[PDB]
Design an enzyme around this catalytic site. Structure first.
Site, PDB file in Angstrom:
ATOM      1  N   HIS A  41      13.181  32.566  34.069  1.00 32.18           N
ATOM      2  CA  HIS A  41      14.097  32.144  33.211  1.00 32.18           C
ATOM      3  C   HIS A  41      14.065  30.570  33.100  1.00 32.18           C
ATOM      4  CE1 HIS A  41      16.567  31.346  36.980  1.00 32.18           C
ATOM      5  NE2 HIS A  41      17.007  30.311  36.110  1.00 32.18           N
ATOM      6  N   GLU A  72      10.362  37.570  38.662  1.00 39.59           N
ATOM      7  CA  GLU A  72      11.019  36.231  38.386  1.00 39.59           C
ATOM      8  C   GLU A  72      10.475  35.017  38.945  1.00 39.59           C
ATOM      9  OE1 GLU A  72      13.261  36.344  36.147  1.00 39.59           O
ATOM     10  OE2 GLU A  72      14.320  34.270  36.207  1.00 39.59           O
ATOM     11  N   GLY A 146      22.450  25.078  39.342  1.00 43.01           N
ATOM     12  CA  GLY A 146      21.782  23.771  39.994  1.00 43.01           C
ATOM     13  C   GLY A 146      21.023  24.186  40.985  1.00 43.01           C
ATOM     14  N   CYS A 148      18.698  26.906  41.222  1.00 45.33           N
ATOM     15  CA  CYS A 148      17.669  27.666  40.773  1.00 45.33           C
ATOM     16  C   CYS A 148      16.157  26.944  41.196  1.00 45.33           C
ATOM     17  CB  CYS A 148      17.750  28.389  39.217  1.00 45.33           C
ATOM     18  SG  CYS A 148      19.080  29.607  39.473  1.00 45.33           S
TER      19      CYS A 148
END
Length: 181
Positions: A41, A72, A146, A148
């Site tokens: 992402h 992901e 914050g 990730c």
């Protein structure tokens, strides 16, 4: 404070950079040579900022399992003049559950942050921001925007990167040795 935090600190001091895309600032784990990982992402493009320096992306691969399901993890090869310490020998070979994990973050917002998240479940399937995702790890910690790309470790293993949360639980994408052979 103890041997969990000791291993986490050793990984953070040598094997992390701050990555910036158009989608934000991320903790980025360097794995070996010029190869690093970031959550998909982040939408890595042709150019990325590494510690606030314009960096060409030589290759970027958004991983999916053999059922064509999102994992992901994006593997990025960076046009950098320096290699990472090789940490592939700290990656698990198989999907598993863990005790006593640490989530470690380093950004301009959260420098030198270490969180004892405790027990980690092999959760498996997660609808992450609307996207069916596999090989998710879960910890019962109220993780925030914050975090990730934050590195999840146990004493002696690097087991995943933080990719989201639901306000009560946090979720990481598994790292496996077979991604980096």
């Amino acid at each position: 404070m103890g041997p969990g935090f000791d291993f986490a600190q050793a990984i953070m001091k040598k094997n992390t950079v701050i990555a910036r895309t158009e989608k934000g600032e991320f903790t980025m784990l360097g794995v070996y040579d010029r190869v690093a990982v970031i959550p998909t992402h982040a939408s890595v493009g042709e150019i990325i900022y590494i510690n606030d320096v314009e960096t060409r992306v030589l290759d970027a691969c958004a991983l999916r399992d053999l059922t064509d399901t999102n994992l992901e993890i994006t593997i990025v090869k960076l046009d950098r003049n320096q290699k990472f310490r090789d940490i592939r020998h700290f990656l698990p070979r198989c999907e598993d559950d863990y005790n006593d994990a640490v989530l470690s973050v380093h950004t301009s917002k959260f420098p030198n942050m270490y969180i004892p998240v405790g027990q980690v479940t092999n959760y498996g399937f997660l609808n992450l921001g609307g996207t069916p995702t596999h090989r998710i790890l879960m910890y019962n910690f109220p993780t925030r925007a914050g975090q990730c790309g934050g590195v999840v470790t146990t004493t002696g293993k690097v087991i995943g990167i933080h990719v989201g949360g639901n306000g009560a639980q946090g979720f990481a994408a598994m790292l496996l040795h077979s991604y980096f052979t």
